[PDB]
Amino acid sequence: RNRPGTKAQDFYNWTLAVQQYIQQNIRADCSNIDKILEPPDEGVWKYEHLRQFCLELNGLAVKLQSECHPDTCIFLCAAHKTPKECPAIDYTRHTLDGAACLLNSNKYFPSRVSIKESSVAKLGSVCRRIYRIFSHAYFHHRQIFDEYENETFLCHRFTKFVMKYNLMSKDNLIVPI
Amino acid sequence: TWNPKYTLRSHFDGVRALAFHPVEPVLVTASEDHTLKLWNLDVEPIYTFRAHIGPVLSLAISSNGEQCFSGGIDATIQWWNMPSPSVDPYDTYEPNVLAGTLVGHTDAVWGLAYSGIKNQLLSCSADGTVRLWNPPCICTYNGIPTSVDFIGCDPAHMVTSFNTGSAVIYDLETSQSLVILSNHINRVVSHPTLPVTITAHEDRHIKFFDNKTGKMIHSMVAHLDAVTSLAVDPNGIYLMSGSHDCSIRLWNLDSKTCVQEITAHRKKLDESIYDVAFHSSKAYIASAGADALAKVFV
Amino acid sequence: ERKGQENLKKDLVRRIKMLEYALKQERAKYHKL
Amino acid sequence: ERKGQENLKKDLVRRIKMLEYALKQ
Amino acid sequence: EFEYADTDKWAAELSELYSYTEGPEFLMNRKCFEEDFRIHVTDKKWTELDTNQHRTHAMRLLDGLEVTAREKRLKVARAILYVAQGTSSEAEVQSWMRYNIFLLLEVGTFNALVELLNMEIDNISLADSTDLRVLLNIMYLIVETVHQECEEWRTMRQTFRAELGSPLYNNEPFAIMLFGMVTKFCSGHAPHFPMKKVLLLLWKTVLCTLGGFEELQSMKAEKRSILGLPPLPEDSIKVIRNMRAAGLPWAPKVREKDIEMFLESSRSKFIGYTLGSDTNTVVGLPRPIHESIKTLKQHKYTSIAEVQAQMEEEYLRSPLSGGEEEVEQVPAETLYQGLLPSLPQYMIALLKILLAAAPTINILADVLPTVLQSMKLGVDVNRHKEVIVKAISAVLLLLLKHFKLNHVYQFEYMAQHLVFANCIPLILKFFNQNIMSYITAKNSISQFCWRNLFSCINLLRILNKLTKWKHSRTMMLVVFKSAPILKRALKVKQAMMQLYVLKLLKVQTKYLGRQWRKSNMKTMSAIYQKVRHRLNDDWAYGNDWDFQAEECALRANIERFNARRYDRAHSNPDFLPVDNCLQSVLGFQMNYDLWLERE
Ligand SMILES: O=P(O)(O)O[C@H]1[C@@H](OP(=O)(O)O)[C@@H](OP(=O)(O)O)[C@@H](OP(=O)(O)O)[C@@H](OP(=O)(O)O)[C@H]1OP(=O)(O)O
Ligand SMILES: [Zn+2]
Ligand SMILES: [Zn+2]
């Protein structure tokens, strides 16, 4: 565990271990793309990994919202009931909230041990949503995107991940690895 | 008397803290996702806060019911004006929400408490320095301050836990700690009456003391795990004792046996349920556990 | 009897609320000194 | 329903008893 | 010749979706999809490709489907439509269609399409509405194919057909969205909706999510067994399939009312005093009367409607002595929960569209864009209206049957607002033309036009469901002088149509006067052969009403049922709990000073 009063590094000084496995692989180094992307199942693994991906992406979200000014800041959002063009920052926020909704939707994911194949199609939708955020970052805010990628090679990780599981076209990728 | 009615499942990683709105049927839940969510009452969140970086540890609500303070890994504190209920979750982002930002001790904020005087608030960190804040005047204390809280009956007196095994009481206008009372101490709370002050030990013994001589009036073994969190009824009758045994218990301030026991949470790691929070106007109880699953019983 | 006890509850609620006001005033008075 | 009201009343009178003892000091 | 099934053969269905006006669209579809295909991958064909190539391309389509430009979205949707068609050999294109459609399901096209459909909802001529049309096409196709095989992918169709009927769209099933479209059209505040396709899609989704007539009969049998009632005497569908034009195939039935009426007549005649609604006291009557009573009560037929009404009045008697029941959420029940708020407007709108589509609110907006072109457009408009009538009749009939099977009072609540909108005179007026021509109307370009005949049989079945065991409505059937219309429609050599005409003639032949009976015997002979016979019935020798009163009584019964089962919030305001929990505890100086100084 990590009891309270433990400042930063004691956190690493210490069911559903798939998330704990992912966490151990991440803390190992934020650099090893394949090593984390090395499966231990395949479906529930995709599930937990998309969860972790949006989790890490919250960081990019706050980093962008810090300076997602309309100075330079596409597609239309879908978290709204009727899809409206909530712009870049609004799009990012609504997409993250809708991904939380889906990934935590009871009717599509009651448990985290056995996901029906009638649900793994949604993962394609959500990663398609993710890559829109990534495109906006790489295009309008290249520098902070690169900063966050230096912090953690998210875009590289997810490109290798999708190419591993084929959720999105390779032609859809425009970010260099 | 308390049956499960809601399971606020929209947080990914463990929900470290949670607190109920004073009057509204609204609940705020801070997790380790670096983001916290506000909910209004199988339910979906109403707002998400995209301002905190690093996992969030501690949270407090402005007693008026309009502002929220948070402090976690980022060693900073954020202060939002919560949007009123009935807002749209999928709405246009409003940058003013993060009105306040507090930069203090360079370490993670482990303990957060609001003051009923509506001008101050206590922030304890792993830095070893507790800070009293005014939303820019800060009074610091250089005494392992795990838990630091605000006595309610007199806002002059405040408490401070320690990873040693004791807890020290001190004042507001004096900054001079009065007396200690007796090993990790997870969570400390203050009764809405002046003397009684409750503490939770790593040795699974809920203990009680007085703000005038710190007497060990009562030490009852609580659960089979280090009691992580405590929550006090807004009128001081019952007491929520959240324990790493994934078993929350409603004790009674008179009868200190298992007045009620609910157990619904998973042992995702060596650490289990983080925090427990009463209501104050609607009599709901919420529990924020290690698996990011806020249960709500009515 | 149910209705009567319900009104008794309303009475006790009034009593508790006025007790709250009284104790808040006494706390403020003691805090001033 | 009457039993529930009874228990609530017992709770409230315990509250008032404790409050008055606290007022004694 | 004619084989009454829940739907025509798949090829006829697919042909009966596109107007003869929107032909060239097909070209565009290919000329759209191909082009994008060309850019995505090169030198290949969709058929010579393999599985993961198909899935990648489908995901690319779904991705492209979210651009914020209506024009590019239309382009992408046309591509998806061509995919759904897939296109040589008709069996080949059928197989490739089934394949492509199950693929588009697997990738998850349907939810994206539903979202885009909502988008188009929240906003003369054909091109007035192309996008919607295009969109609707796909959905229909999908459902069609998925249900065309609803009789590998077993799990696929099962989960689909289960989610389509589940309240996942604004917490309402898909059919509710389609009904909303229909209402918003009839209200004249959405004059561009393509109505043939909306109606067809509503029909097919009601079909696949509720089940056709065979699954209807099966569910009826199971609900009979569950309630303990004895099984049904015949196999109605088979019996009607094995009839002829113009034997005694129907085992006679006798409802409880007849037993009680006969027994009370006998009591008055032999015991000098009637008893009243008792059917067990038979002791003083002579033996030749006990024989008749036994013969009757051994031929009794108690349907689910009677026991359900009994349970309803029971619940209403003893509300909280365990009377609170749970109701299964079978798709019919959820659909009724969805429709209940604004049902009457739905029914009025359906009937308005019907009346606008009878052979003799611009419904033809969908189809409207040389004498040959004028003739083709005329036959096309006739075909448009024929299909609209077919869809509406089938929807109404399926809803009626499924509601009556689910719970009788739902059927009554639908039928009441269906007759209030003058459905009886509407149908009769629909039947006041040369029916034979309508049935043999060969209004199609690549006997019995299966479409028209199916629709007419359905209209008769509906009219029967509306007016049966309700004396006031039967007297209405008499008032509008239906008989010369019915027995004129009797000329169609089909067997089921004849049967359902006779089902009405027999029900109203008592009030038609001896002379009429004496004049028409061939029809009386037909009624003798075809229709089921009730014991102690007096149609052949009948001797001989408060419409509004009987209505306003049934209405009260219905509304009581509805309020009890779908207004549990307000239900039973007399007995309410009080929250004894401490949420209430938080739910001028003298007032302090003296109160403290009390001791
Ligand atoms: O009462 P149900 O169990 O619901 O069966 C009735 C009805 O039975 P009743 O005669 O007791 O009213 C008729 O059946 P028959 O008259 O042929 O005996 C009716 O036929 P019509 O509507 O043509 O009068 C129809 O059976 P079907 O729909 O096959 O024609 C219908 O059964 P459902 O209500 O389940 O449709
Ligand atoms: Zn931006
Ligand atoms: Zn949005």
PDB file of C-alpha atoms in Angstrom, chain E residues 6-192:
ATOM      1  CA  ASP E   6     -45.792 -11.499 -41.872  1.00  0.00           C
ATOM      2  CA  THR E   7     -43.959  -9.998 -44.855  1.00  0.00           C
ATOM      3  CA  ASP E   8     -43.504 -10.533 -48.568  1.00  0.00           C
ATOM      4  CA  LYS E   9     -40.427 -12.303 -49.890  1.00  0.00           C
ATOM      5  CA  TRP E  10     -37.159 -10.476 -49.352  1.00  0.00           C
ATOM      6  CA  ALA E  11     -36.705  -9.438 -52.981  1.00  0.00           C
ATOM      7  CA  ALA E  12     -40.129  -7.814 -53.119  1.00  0.00           C
ATOM      8  CA  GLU E  13     -39.408  -5.999 -49.854  1.00  0.00           C
ATOM      9  CA  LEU E  14     -36.127  -4.570 -51.091  1.00  0.00           C
ATOM     10  CA  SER E  15     -37.792  -3.513 -54.325  1.00  0.00           C
ATOM     11  CA  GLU E  16     -40.551  -1.836 -52.303  1.00  0.00           C
ATOM     12  CA  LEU E  17     -38.286   0.681 -50.581  1.00  0.00           C
ATOM     13  CA  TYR E  18     -36.923   2.826 -53.397  1.00  0.00           C
ATOM     14  CA  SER E  19     -39.231   4.998 -55.440  1.00  0.00           C
ATOM     15  CA  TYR E  20     -39.067   4.621 -59.196  1.00  0.00           C
ATOM     16  CA  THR E  21     -37.875   8.246 -59.057  1.00  0.00           C
ATOM     17  CA  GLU E  22     -34.736   7.796 -56.932  1.00  0.00           C
ATOM     18  CA  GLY E  23     -33.263   5.223 -59.314  1.00  0.00           C
ATOM     19  CA  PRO E  24     -30.144   7.131 -60.394  1.00  0.00           C
ATOM     20  CA  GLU E  25     -29.140   7.389 -56.739  1.00  0.00           C
ATOM     21  CA  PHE E  26     -27.630   3.919 -57.110  1.00  0.00           C
ATOM     22  CA  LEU E  27     -25.072   5.233 -59.591  1.00  0.00           C
ATOM     23  CA  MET E  28     -24.150   8.067 -57.243  1.00  0.00           C
ATOM     24  CA  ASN E  29     -23.677   5.610 -54.390  1.00  0.00           C
ATOM     25  CA  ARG E  30     -21.065   3.638 -56.297  1.00  0.00           C
ATOM     26  CA  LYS E  31     -19.576   6.784 -57.815  1.00  0.00           C
ATOM     27  CA  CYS E  32     -19.194   7.933 -54.230  1.00  0.00           C
ATOM     28  CA  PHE E  33     -17.967   4.801 -52.467  1.00  0.00           C
ATOM     29  CA  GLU E  34     -15.643   3.679 -55.252  1.00  0.00           C
ATOM     30  CA  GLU E  35     -13.888   7.039 -55.298  1.00  0.00           C
ATOM     31  CA  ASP E  36     -13.121   6.929 -51.579  1.00  0.00           C
ATOM     32  CA  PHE E  37     -12.249   3.261 -51.956  1.00  0.00           C
ATOM     33  CA  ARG E  38      -9.772   4.278 -54.650  1.00  0.00           C
ATOM     34  CA  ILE E  39      -8.000   6.612 -52.239  1.00  0.00           C
ATOM     35  CA  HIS E  40      -8.056   4.315 -49.219  1.00  0.00           C
ATOM     36  CA  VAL E  41      -6.594   1.256 -50.963  1.00  0.00           C
ATOM     37  CA  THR E  42      -5.695   0.794 -54.617  1.00  0.00           C
ATOM     38  CA  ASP E  43      -5.921  -1.813 -57.413  1.00  0.00           C
ATOM     39  CA  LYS E  44      -8.315  -4.028 -55.420  1.00  0.00           C
ATOM     40  CA  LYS E  45     -12.043  -4.730 -55.292  1.00  0.00           C
ATOM     41  CA  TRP E  46     -14.323  -4.971 -52.277  1.00  0.00           C
ATOM     42  CA  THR E  47     -15.173  -8.580 -53.107  1.00  0.00           C
ATOM     43  CA  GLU E  48     -11.630  -9.818 -53.719  1.00  0.00           C
ATOM     44  CA  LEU E  49     -10.529  -8.280 -50.411  1.00  0.00           C
ATOM     45  CA  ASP E  50     -10.380 -10.165 -47.122  1.00  0.00           C
ATOM     46  CA  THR E  51     -11.897  -9.828 -43.668  1.00  0.00           C
ATOM     47  CA  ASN E  52      -9.637  -7.376 -41.865  1.00  0.00           C
ATOM     48  CA  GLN E  53      -9.471  -5.190 -44.967  1.00  0.00           C
ATOM     49  CA  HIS E  54     -13.260  -4.993 -44.874  1.00  0.00           C
ATOM     50  CA  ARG E  55     -13.253  -4.177 -41.167  1.00  0.00           C
ATOM     51  CA  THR E  56     -10.588  -1.497 -41.573  1.00  0.00           C
ATOM     52  CA  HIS E  57     -12.556   0.110 -44.380  1.00  0.00           C
ATOM     53  CA  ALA E  58     -15.724   0.003 -42.291  1.00  0.00           C
ATOM     54  CA  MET E  59     -13.968   1.713 -39.403  1.00  0.00           C
ATOM     55  CA  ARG E  60     -12.689   4.314 -41.862  1.00  0.00           C
ATOM     56  CA  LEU E  61     -16.254   4.919 -43.000  1.00  0.00           C
ATOM     57  CA  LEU E  62     -17.499   5.320 -39.437  1.00  0.00           C
ATOM     58  CA  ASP E  63     -14.615   7.697 -38.757  1.00  0.00           C
ATOM     59  CA  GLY E  64     -15.384   9.837 -41.792  1.00  0.00           C
ATOM     60  CA  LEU E  65     -19.032   9.872 -40.783  1.00  0.00           C
ATOM     61  CA  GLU E  66     -18.410  12.579 -38.120  1.00  0.00           C
ATOM     62  CA  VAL E  67     -17.212  15.509 -40.225  1.00  0.00           C
ATOM     63  CA  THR E  68     -19.072  18.711 -39.416  1.00  0.00           C
ATOM     64  CA  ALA E  69     -19.987  19.411 -43.056  1.00  0.00           C
ATOM     65  CA  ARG E  70     -23.368  18.153 -44.224  1.00  0.00           C
ATOM     66  CA  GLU E  71     -22.043  17.620 -47.745  1.00  0.00           C
ATOM     67  CA  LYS E  72     -19.114  15.399 -46.829  1.00  0.00           C
ATOM     68  CA  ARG E  73     -21.344  13.549 -44.376  1.00  0.00           C
ATOM     69  CA  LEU E  74     -23.815  12.923 -47.188  1.00  0.00           C
ATOM     70  CA  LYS E  75     -20.983  11.646 -49.366  1.00  0.00           C
ATOM     71  CA  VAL E  76     -19.783   9.254 -46.669  1.00  0.00           C
ATOM     72  CA  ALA E  77     -23.312   8.044 -45.977  1.00  0.00           C
ATOM     73  CA  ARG E  78     -23.886   7.341 -49.656  1.00  0.00           C
ATOM     74  CA  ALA E  79     -20.710   5.274 -49.561  1.00  0.00           C
ATOM     75  CA  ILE E  80     -21.987   3.339 -46.550  1.00  0.00           C
ATOM     76  CA  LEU E  81     -25.277   2.782 -48.351  1.00  0.00           C
ATOM     77  CA  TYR E  82     -23.520   1.305 -51.367  1.00  0.00           C
ATOM     78  CA  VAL E  83     -21.628  -0.915 -48.944  1.00  0.00           C
ATOM     79  CA  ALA E  84     -24.906  -2.042 -47.393  1.00  0.00           C
ATOM     80  CA  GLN E  85     -25.960  -3.035 -50.889  1.00  0.00           C
ATOM     81  CA  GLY E  86     -22.462  -4.354 -51.601  1.00  0.00           C
ATOM     82  CA  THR E  87     -22.936  -4.748 -55.375  1.00  0.00           C
ATOM     83  CA  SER E  88     -24.384  -9.677 -60.863  1.00  0.00           C
ATOM     84  CA  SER E  89     -26.417 -12.616 -59.581  1.00  0.00           C
ATOM     85  CA  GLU E  90     -29.408 -11.854 -57.362  1.00  0.00           C
ATOM     86  CA  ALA E  91     -28.477 -14.688 -55.003  1.00  0.00           C
ATOM     87  CA  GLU E  92     -24.919 -13.378 -55.121  1.00  0.00           C
ATOM     88  CA  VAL E  93     -25.935  -9.845 -54.177  1.00  0.00           C
ATOM     89  CA  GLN E  94     -28.202 -11.305 -51.497  1.00  0.00           C
ATOM     90  CA  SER E  95     -25.344 -13.215 -49.885  1.00  0.00           C
ATOM     91  CA  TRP E  96     -22.961 -10.283 -50.214  1.00  0.00           C
ATOM     92  CA  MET E  97     -25.624  -8.020 -48.711  1.00  0.00           C
ATOM     93  CA  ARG E  98     -26.094 -10.299 -45.728  1.00  0.00           C
ATOM     94  CA  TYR E  99     -22.322 -10.395 -45.273  1.00  0.00           C
ATOM     95  CA  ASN E 100     -21.737  -6.651 -45.597  1.00  0.00           C
ATOM     96  CA  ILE E 101     -24.639  -5.894 -43.290  1.00  0.00           C
ATOM     97  CA  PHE E 102     -23.446  -8.185 -40.546  1.00  0.00           C
ATOM     98  CA  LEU E 103     -20.059  -6.536 -40.979  1.00  0.00           C
ATOM     99  CA  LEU E 104     -21.510  -3.040 -40.586  1.00  0.00           C
ATOM    100  CA  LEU E 105     -23.241  -4.348 -37.487  1.00  0.00           C
ATOM    101  CA  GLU E 106     -20.016  -5.789 -36.097  1.00  0.00           C
ATOM    102  CA  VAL E 107     -18.154  -2.515 -36.514  1.00  0.00           C
ATOM    103  CA  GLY E 108     -21.119  -0.734 -34.936  1.00  0.00           C
ATOM    104  CA  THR E 109     -22.636   1.392 -37.678  1.00  0.00           C
ATOM    105  CA  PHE E 110     -26.108   1.460 -36.195  1.00  0.00           C
ATOM    106  CA  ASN E 111     -25.428   3.702 -33.213  1.00  0.00           C
ATOM    107  CA  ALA E 112     -23.544   6.211 -35.343  1.00  0.00           C
ATOM    108  CA  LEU E 113     -26.489   6.231 -37.723  1.00  0.00           C
ATOM    109  CA  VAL E 114     -28.941   6.787 -34.877  1.00  0.00           C
ATOM    110  CA  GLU E 115     -26.925   9.737 -33.584  1.00  0.00           C
ATOM    111  CA  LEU E 116     -26.777  11.270 -37.049  1.00  0.00           C
ATOM    112  CA  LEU E 117     -30.517  10.660 -37.339  1.00  0.00           C
ATOM    113  CA  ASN E 118     -31.162  12.607 -34.149  1.00  0.00           C
ATOM    114  CA  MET E 119     -28.980  15.366 -35.572  1.00  0.00           C
ATOM    115  CA  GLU E 120     -31.149  15.473 -38.684  1.00  0.00           C
ATOM    116  CA  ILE E 121     -34.287  15.350 -36.532  1.00  0.00           C
ATOM    117  CA  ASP E 122     -33.424  18.461 -34.552  1.00  0.00           C
ATOM    118  CA  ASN E 123     -33.510  20.657 -37.642  1.00  0.00           C
ATOM    119  CA  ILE E 124     -42.268  19.830 -52.119  1.00  0.00           C
ATOM    120  CA  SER E 125     -39.819  17.608 -53.983  1.00  0.00           C
ATOM    121  CA  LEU E 126     -37.572  14.591 -53.590  1.00  0.00           C
ATOM    122  CA  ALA E 127     -34.235  16.406 -53.310  1.00  0.00           C
ATOM    123  CA  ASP E 128     -35.833  18.491 -50.558  1.00  0.00           C
ATOM    124  CA  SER E 129     -34.689  15.646 -48.289  1.00  0.00           C
ATOM    125  CA  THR E 130     -31.950  13.421 -49.648  1.00  0.00           C
ATOM    126  CA  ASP E 131     -29.674  13.050 -46.630  1.00  0.00           C
ATOM    127  CA  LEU E 132     -32.416  11.806 -44.327  1.00  0.00           C
ATOM    128  CA  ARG E 133     -33.608   9.501 -47.107  1.00  0.00           C
ATOM    129  CA  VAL E 134     -30.094   8.156 -47.593  1.00  0.00           C
ATOM    130  CA  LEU E 135     -29.675   7.705 -43.857  1.00  0.00           C
ATOM    131  CA  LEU E 136     -33.031   5.996 -43.465  1.00  0.00           C
ATOM    132  CA  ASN E 137     -32.248   3.643 -46.331  1.00  0.00           C
ATOM    133  CA  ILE E 138     -29.280   2.161 -44.511  1.00  0.00           C
ATOM    134  CA  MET E 139     -31.169   1.594 -41.281  1.00  0.00           C
ATOM    135  CA  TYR E 140     -34.026  -0.135 -43.062  1.00  0.00           C
ATOM    136  CA  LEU E 141     -31.667  -2.315 -45.063  1.00  0.00           C
ATOM    137  CA  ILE E 142     -29.858  -3.312 -41.890  1.00  0.00           C
ATOM    138  CA  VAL E 143     -32.986  -4.270 -39.990  1.00  0.00           C
ATOM    139  CA  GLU E 144     -34.415  -5.931 -43.076  1.00  0.00           C
ATOM    140  CA  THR E 145     -31.443  -8.190 -43.645  1.00  0.00           C
ATOM    141  CA  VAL E 146     -30.992  -8.872 -39.949  1.00  0.00           C
ATOM    142  CA  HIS E 147     -34.600  -9.862 -39.662  1.00  0.00           C
ATOM    143  CA  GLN E 148     -34.680 -11.519 -43.071  1.00  0.00           C
ATOM    144  CA  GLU E 149     -32.417 -14.064 -41.400  1.00  0.00           C
ATOM    145  CA  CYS E 150     -34.160 -13.842 -38.017  1.00  0.00           C
ATOM    146  CA  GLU E 151     -35.903 -17.089 -38.964  1.00  0.00           C
ATOM    147  CA  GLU E 152     -23.262 -18.185 -37.102  1.00  0.00           C
ATOM    148  CA  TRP E 153     -24.485 -14.633 -36.478  1.00  0.00           C
ATOM    149  CA  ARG E 154     -27.195 -16.133 -34.285  1.00  0.00           C
ATOM    150  CA  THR E 155     -25.668 -14.261 -31.367  1.00  0.00           C
ATOM    151  CA  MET E 156     -25.361 -11.217 -33.626  1.00  0.00           C
ATOM    152  CA  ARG E 157     -29.030 -11.051 -34.556  1.00  0.00           C
ATOM    153  CA  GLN E 158     -29.997 -11.922 -30.989  1.00  0.00           C
ATOM    154  CA  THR E 159     -28.037  -9.108 -29.368  1.00  0.00           C
ATOM    155  CA  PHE E 160     -29.085  -6.683 -32.102  1.00  0.00           C
ATOM    156  CA  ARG E 161     -32.799  -7.506 -31.981  1.00  0.00           C
ATOM    157  CA  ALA E 162     -32.468  -7.237 -28.208  1.00  0.00           C
ATOM    158  CA  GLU E 163     -30.820  -3.819 -28.133  1.00  0.00           C
ATOM    159  CA  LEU E 164     -32.970  -2.314 -30.890  1.00  0.00           C
ATOM    160  CA  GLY E 165     -35.957  -2.769 -28.608  1.00  0.00           C
ATOM    161  CA  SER E 166     -34.195  -1.635 -25.519  1.00  0.00           C
ATOM    162  CA  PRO E 167     -34.612   1.946 -24.290  1.00  0.00           C
ATOM    163  CA  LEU E 168     -31.129   3.096 -25.284  1.00  0.00           C
ATOM    164  CA  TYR E 169     -32.124   6.187 -27.287  1.00  0.00           C
ATOM    165  CA  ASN E 170     -33.295   9.073 -25.118  1.00  0.00           C
ATOM    166  CA  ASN E 171     -34.289   6.226 -22.783  1.00  0.00           C
ATOM    167  CA  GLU E 172     -36.834   5.125 -25.386  1.00  0.00           C
ATOM    168  CA  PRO E 173     -36.755   2.316 -27.958  1.00  0.00           C
ATOM    169  CA  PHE E 174     -36.070   3.090 -31.586  1.00  0.00           C
ATOM    170  CA  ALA E 175     -39.746   2.813 -32.475  1.00  0.00           C
ATOM    171  CA  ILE E 176     -40.444   5.760 -30.191  1.00  0.00           C
ATOM    172  CA  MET E 177     -38.038   7.891 -32.200  1.00  0.00           C
ATOM    173  CA  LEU E 178     -39.776   6.860 -35.402  1.00  0.00           C
ATOM    174  CA  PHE E 179     -43.183   7.653 -33.924  1.00  0.00           C
ATOM    175  CA  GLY E 180     -41.826  11.043 -32.952  1.00  0.00           C
ATOM    176  CA  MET E 181     -40.789  11.605 -36.545  1.00  0.00           C
ATOM    177  CA  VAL E 182     -44.277  10.681 -37.742  1.00  0.00           C
ATOM    178  CA  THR E 183     -45.961  13.021 -35.273  1.00  0.00           C
ATOM    179  CA  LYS E 184     -43.619  15.900 -36.077  1.00  0.00           C
ATOM    180  CA  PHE E 185     -44.564  15.382 -39.709  1.00  0.00           C
ATOM    181  CA  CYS E 186     -48.347  15.211 -39.391  1.00  0.00           C
ATOM    182  CA  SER E 187     -48.148  18.356 -37.258  1.00  0.00           C
ATOM    183  CA  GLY E 188     -47.038  20.144 -40.431  1.00  0.00           C
ATOM    184  CA  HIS E 189     -43.922  21.374 -38.614  1.00  0.00           C
ATOM    185  CA  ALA E 190     -41.588  19.007 -40.468  1.00  0.00           C
ATOM    186  CA  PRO E 191     -42.822  19.021 -44.071  1.00  0.00           C
ATOM    187  CA  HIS E 192     -39.718  17.364 -45.538  1.00  0.00           C
TER     188      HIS E 192
END
